[PDB]
Amino acid sequence: QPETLRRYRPGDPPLAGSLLIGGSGRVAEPLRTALADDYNLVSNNIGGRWADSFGGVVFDATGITEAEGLKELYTFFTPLLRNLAPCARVVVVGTTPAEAGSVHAQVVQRALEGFTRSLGKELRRGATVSLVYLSADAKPGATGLESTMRFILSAKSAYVDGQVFRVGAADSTPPADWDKPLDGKVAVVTGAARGIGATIAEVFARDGATVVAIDVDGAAEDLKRVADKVGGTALTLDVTADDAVDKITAHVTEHHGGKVDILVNNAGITRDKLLANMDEKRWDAVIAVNLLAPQRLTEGLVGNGTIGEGGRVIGLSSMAGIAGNRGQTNYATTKAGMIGLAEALAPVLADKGITINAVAPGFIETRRLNSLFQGGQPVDVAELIAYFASPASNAVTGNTIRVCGQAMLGA
C-alpha cells in the first residue's frame, strides 16, 4: 500500500521521531551542535535501546578514505534500520569525490552513491534516502551545509528520494527564522497563474516572500487571484516578449523596492510530436518559451542589477530533459538546456553572489514506478525550489535535483 506522506505545516516538528547523527568524519560534531535545539538528538548506544523511533539518521562518511573503511556504512546502519519511523530521513554526508584528496578516497566517496540509491530501494513506509557531498574546503563549522540538512530533515522533502546534493565551500548565515526563511525576499515566479507555478507562489509566501506572479494576458483573472491570495502582485506578460525584462524591472521598481531576490523560470509549454512529423512552429515555440526566455530573463535581470548579491535563480527542468521522452525532442532539448543554464552560469554568477540551480520533476499529479509507489504533488516541487531559494543556500549552486520519489526512469 502507498504511504500517505507527511508534508510540512507550521508548528509541526521537523521529524516524526528522534535524530541520530553518527560517523567519524568532520561534519558529525558541528552538525549535532547546529541541530540540537530544533531537533530531538539522541546518541547511538551498543545496547540498541531508544525510547522513540528515528525520524532521521545521518551518517558522516567524510572520514572514510579506504575501501576497507566502507564497512563503517554496514556496521553503523544495520543495527539502526528497524527503528526507523514511517517517513523517516536517512542521509549520508560525504566529501565531493574529486576533492577527497587521494585516489583511494575519491573512489570510496564516489562509491557512496551506489550505497544510498540501493538503500533507498529498501526503506519502507515513505522513508527516503539522500546523499550530500560537502567540499573539502568547507570550514570546520560546516555552516554552508545547514540549509541542505534542514530541508532533507523535514517533511518538506517528502517526495525527494535517492538524490545527491552538492554543497560547496562557502560559509552561510541562517535566516532570522528557519520557519520563515524567505522573509523580506522579493520572488518572481513565471507561469504562476496555475499548476506548479501557482503552488510555488503559495509556498514562497508561506515562507515569508513577496511574490510577483507572472503569466500571460489570457490568464489575468486567475493570476490576480493567486497574487491576492499570497499577498503579492500580478504582472501580466509574455516571457518571450522583447520588453519582458523592462516590464519586470519597472514592476518591482514600482512595488517592491527595485530588486528581485529570487527568480523561478517556471513558465513552459509542450508541443509534442515525433521529430519525423514535426513542423517548424512546434519546434520554435517550445525553444522560445522554455529555453530562450529563461536565458534572457536571467541574463537581463542580472545584467541590469535587479538580481544582485544574494540572488537565487531556479529553473524548471524535467525528467524528460535527463532521460529523454518519445515525442519530445523539442521539449527535452529545452529541459536539458535548463540544466545547461544552471551549469554554465553557476561560475559566472558566483562572482556576483548569485546561485542558479535546476529542479527536474518526475510524475507530478497535475505514477507507481518509484520507491514511494505514488505520484508527486505540486507542493513537493515547490518545497525543493524554496530550499534552493533560501538565503542560507548560498553554498548550493549548479545542482540539478530530481523530485520523483526515486523514480525508476533516468539516465
Place this chain on the structure above:
Amino acid sequence: QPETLRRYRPGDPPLAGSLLIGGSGRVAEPLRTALADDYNLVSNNIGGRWADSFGGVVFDATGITEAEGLKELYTFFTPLLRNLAPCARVVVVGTTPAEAGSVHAQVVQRALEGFTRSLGKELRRGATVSLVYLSADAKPGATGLESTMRFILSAKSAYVDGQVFRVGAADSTPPADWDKPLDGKVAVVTGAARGIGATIAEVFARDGATVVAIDVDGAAEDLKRVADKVGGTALTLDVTADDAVDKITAHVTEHHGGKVDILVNNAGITRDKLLANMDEKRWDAVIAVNLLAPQRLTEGLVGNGTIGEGGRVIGLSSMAGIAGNRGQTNYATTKAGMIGLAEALAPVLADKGITINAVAPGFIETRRLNSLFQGGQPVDVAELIAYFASPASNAVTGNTIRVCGQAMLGA
C-alpha cells in the same frame, strides 16, 4: 515485435546502408575524409533522393553556439528520418559543454543530450542514437574521434543506445587493421571461465589480442577450454590473493613478453541481502572481490610497469551501481566504486599514457523495458569493452558507458 539485431562478423560492411555526414561544425569534413574509403558516403540533397537507405546519419553540432541555432537539429534530421534502415546509427557530435567557449554555447551543447535521448525513443527497428562530445582543444583532423565513430557506426554497437561518449583532445594513431584492432596486444581478463568474461576473451581474440584468461582453481577445466579456444593462456588464481599481482606478472613474463596492454576487471560476485538482514561475510566478500581486487590489480600492475604506455584498463560496473538496487547495498557500492576507480585514476594514469574506463551493463541474457525491447547479449558488452581497449581509443578515458538498449532504469 523485437528486432533481430545485426551484430558484427568479419567481412560484413560496417553499416547496413549509406553514411550521410552533415552539419556546419569543425568535425564534418575531417570525418568525411577519414571514413570515405571504408563507408559508402552520400551527400545531402534538397530533393530528398537517395538510392539506398541510411545505415548511418551523423550531425556535426560543434558549430552551434546559440539556442536559435538548435533549429539546425530540426532542419537537418526531419527530412532524413524516414530513410533510415533497420539497425541504423544516428550520431550527434558536439563540443564538451564546459569547453564550448561561452555561456550560450555551453547551454546549447549541454542541451544536445535531451535531444539525442528523446530521438532514441523514436527510432524504430533496432536503430540507435549516440551523442559524442569532442574536446574544444582537439586538432582540426579530429583523429582522436575516429575509434569512437567506428565503434558506433558498426554492428558492434548493437545494444549501446542513448549513450554519451566523451572524447578528449589527444591525437590518435589507427591500428594497422581496423578489423584486427587488438593485433599484438596482451589482454588480461579476470573471471574469464564463464559468462561475460568468456565472451570478452573470444571477442578480444577475434580482434587479434593474446588473452590471459584468469579464474579460480575450481574453474580450471572450463578456464583451459576458453584459453585453448582463443589461442591464449590460462592462469588460475583468486584475484583477492595477496600474490595476485606477482602471479600475473610472472605469467606474462613467462609467456607474453613481460607486458599487459589491456586489463579487464570482470571477475565479480553477488551476496544479495537487505542491509537490515545482512551479515559481515556478505558485505566483506563483495567488497573484497568487486572493489579491493580491481583497485589492487590496477595499481599493482601499473605500479610495477607491467601496464605501461598505451595501456587500457576497463572495469565492469553495473546499472545497479548507477541506479541502485534493492538487496544490493554491498554490490552497488562496489559497482559505483568501479566508476570511481575510472574517474579517480584517469588523470593519474594519463601521465603514463594509460586510459581507464567503465562499462555498466543493464539486462544481459546470462528484459523489455528498453528502447530495443529486448535483453542484451554478452557479446554486446564485450564489444564496448573492446572499443575502449583499442590502441586508437587513447583520447577516451574516465568514461562510464551503459550497455542496456537505452533502458528506462537509471539515475
